[PDB]
């Protein structure tokens, strides 16, 4: 039952989110790592300052504050008891972005399996935010915040808070929570991996141009121009440079972790992208298969149907900086 060391996963999430010292923390499990980020992340913000958004308030007060709303004033006859309905702009830290941090901190606190020191600091922080209102979190809340008015820093912790909320399961007690075993399931790990590379490539491969490319079948059908029945085909990543174009398809499988039969079903998808994709520049067309392995990395090259294809692996669990070298090293070989 082998999986990636948990600390390394956090780096892939960071690139996955498009944006620290973990040596200190001794809790190997993910929630220990993730909580320390959020718990420290909030503290970094407070030094510079949390977001304060002017929330207009229309309320019944004993006097003129800002703009009086004449209609609500006369209609309710508030003038007679020395009151007006007046609109003014209170400055709070109670914004939707800020509320989400606090509600998640409760979740972090309630988790049964968590480092004691981590919970101690978090319980302090929950206390340190008296004005903010606790909330019952759903994805719909985070959906409203996709506008991204918040700073580049806030969007990081909110992504963390988004991750915890989605990966929270009740445990021994009705109140307390238990963390999901994220690593074990391939689908979410793969979707991380596929997004991890796409965001990784734009940052590091300044040399090449990186786009996910939608592809259309070469087909024509006598019945329909639409071709809805045909599978929708969108590249995982395409990394085009003037000298060579290249499509990569990457997926996380448990079977491949075993050093026997090999799982290469994804390759069936790949060839058809190469065929249906037609280059105007006509420099060359190449493909790459990259999977995560634990112990060691092996690269093979193939000339299958007039296409230059790579089967390759990376030894996640080695070390994160060396991994960065290994990922760039691979793309150098094939891209050229």
């Amino acid at each position: 039952q082998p999986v990636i060391p948990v600390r390394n996963i956090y780096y892939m999430l960071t690139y996955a989110w498009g944006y620290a010292n973990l040596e200190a923390i001794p809790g190997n499990n993910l929630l220990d790592i993730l909580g320390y980020v959020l718990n420290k992340g909030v503290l970094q913000l407070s030094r510079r300052g949390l977001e304060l958004d002017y929330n207009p308030n229309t309320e019944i007060i004993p006097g003129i504050k800002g703009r009086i709303e004449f209609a609500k004033t006369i209609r309710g006859f508030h003038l007679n008891h020395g009151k007006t309905v007046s609109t003014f702009d209170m400055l709070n830290e109670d914004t939707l972005a800020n509320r989400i941090i606090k509600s998640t901190l409760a979740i972090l606190i309630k988790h049964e399996k968590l480092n004691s020191t981590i919970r101690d600091e978090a319980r302090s922080l929950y206390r340190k935010l008296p004005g903010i209102s606790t909330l019952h979190l759903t994805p719909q809340h985070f959906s409203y915040l996709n506008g991204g008015k918040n700073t580049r820093y806030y969007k990081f912790v909110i992504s963390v808070c988004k991750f915890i909320v989605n990966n929270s399961i009740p445990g021994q007690n009705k109140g307390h929570y238990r963390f999901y075993d994220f690593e074990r399931n391939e689908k979410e790990m793969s979707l991380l991996y596929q997004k991890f590379l796409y965001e990784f490539c734009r940052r590091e491969l300044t040399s090449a141009n990186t786009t996910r490319s939608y592809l259309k079948w070469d087909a024509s059908s006598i019945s329909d121009q639409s071709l809805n029945l045909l599978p929708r085909m969108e590249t995982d990543i395409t990394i085009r440079s003037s000298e060579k174009i290249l499509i990569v398809d990457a997926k996380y499988y448990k079977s491949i972790f075993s050093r026997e039969k090999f799982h290469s079903q994804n390759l069936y998808q790949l060839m058809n992208y190469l065929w249906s994709l037609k280059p105007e520049n006509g420099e060359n067309i190449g493909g790459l298969l990259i999977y995560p392995h634990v112990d060691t990395a092996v690269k093979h090259r193939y000339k299958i149907n007039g296409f230059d294809i790579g089967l390759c692996t990376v030894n996640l669990g080695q070390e994160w900086p060396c991994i960065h070298q290994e990922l760039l090293d691979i793309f150098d070989e094939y891209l050229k």
Binding site: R75, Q140, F142, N146, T211, Q225
Partner: protein, 290 residues
């Protein structure tokens, strides 16, 4: 007011209009719930004239709700004079008074953009009477601002209330409690895949193949939005009213006309919808241009 004038031009199926007419005679409090551009406002003016059977303005009244709308204006309230405060009969109070005189003839009140205002603040006491069963003089009530308890207001049975609500906003996930009990929702489909929508285009010098290609794209596009629940619900999906408009001059439909429409209506709308994935905007825009 013959149905023949009313129902051909409409894109909505003759099946659904019947269902709409059933509930409206039965319940008298009806809400048409559909996205912008599906003719909610368009039908409601026609439906009123269908039911009455004649084109008369007096028997039909139309208003739009908004946050400023309040009880004091709608039903009864006090308006300042140069100095004094005079009580003033509001719309619904004045309108029902017209309805009392002629009980047999059906009367219609059309309330557009109902979700914007809290119904309780506007109707208030009258949400009790406004329900379909609790109508007629037996359930009469004296109003909040009535000088004496003797004066009473009851929503006569003849009036039917039509409310036009658009599920185009994220806030409406928390639908008001007041609407559901007293009003009966009816869903309006966008209705690209309809015979009558096509026939409107065909009469206006349109190729049959071009029209069907368009329907396949939009039906595909709206289906993509329907899949999501977190960011874009079913109600966000595109209406059929961008394409209807702009052909009055006689300018023939073509990709050129569609190209302006996509660039100036549906492309930025998708920019607002799909902020997080810019490429996803491009995927559709070229597809729609295609």
């Amino acid at each position: 007011y013959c149905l023949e004038d009313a129902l051909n031009d409409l894109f909505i199926p003759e099946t659904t209009i019947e269902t709409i007419l059933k509930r409206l005679t039965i319940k008298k409090n009806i809400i048409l719930q559909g996205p912008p551009g599906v003719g909610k406002t368009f039908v409601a003016r026609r439906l009123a004239y269908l039911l009455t059977g004649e084109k008369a303005p007096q028997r039909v009244n139309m208003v739009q709700f908004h946050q400023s709308y309040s009880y004091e204006d709608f039903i009864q309230g006090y308006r300042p004079n140069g100095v004094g405060f005079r009580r003033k009969d509001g719309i619904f109070y004045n309108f029902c008074q017209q309805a009392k005189e002629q009980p047999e003839k059906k009367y219609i009140f059309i309330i557009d953009e109902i979700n914007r205002a809290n119904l309780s603040k506007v109707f208030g006491e009258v949400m009790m009477l406004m329900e379909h069963d609790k109508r007629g003089e037996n359930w009469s009530v004296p109003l909040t601002y009535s000088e004496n308890d003797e004066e009473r207001f009851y929503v006569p049975e003849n009036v039917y209330i039509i409310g036009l609500m658009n599920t185009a906003d994220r806030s409406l996930a928390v639908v008001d409690y007041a609407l559901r009990r007293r009003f009966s929702f009816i869903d309006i489909e966008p209705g690209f895949d309809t015979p009558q929508f096509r026939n409107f285009l065909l009469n206006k010098k349109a190729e049959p193949s071009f029209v069907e290609s368009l329907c396949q794209k939009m039906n595909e596009l709206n289906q993509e939005i329907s899949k999501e629940a977190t960011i874009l619900g079913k109600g966000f999906r595109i209406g059929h009213s961008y394409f209807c408009c702009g052909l009055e001059d006689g300018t023939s439909p073509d990709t050129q006309w569609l190209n302006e429409i996509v660039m100036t209506d549906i492309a930025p709308l998708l920019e607002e919808y799909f902020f997080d994935d810019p490429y996803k905007q491009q995927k559709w825009t070229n597809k729609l241009l295609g």
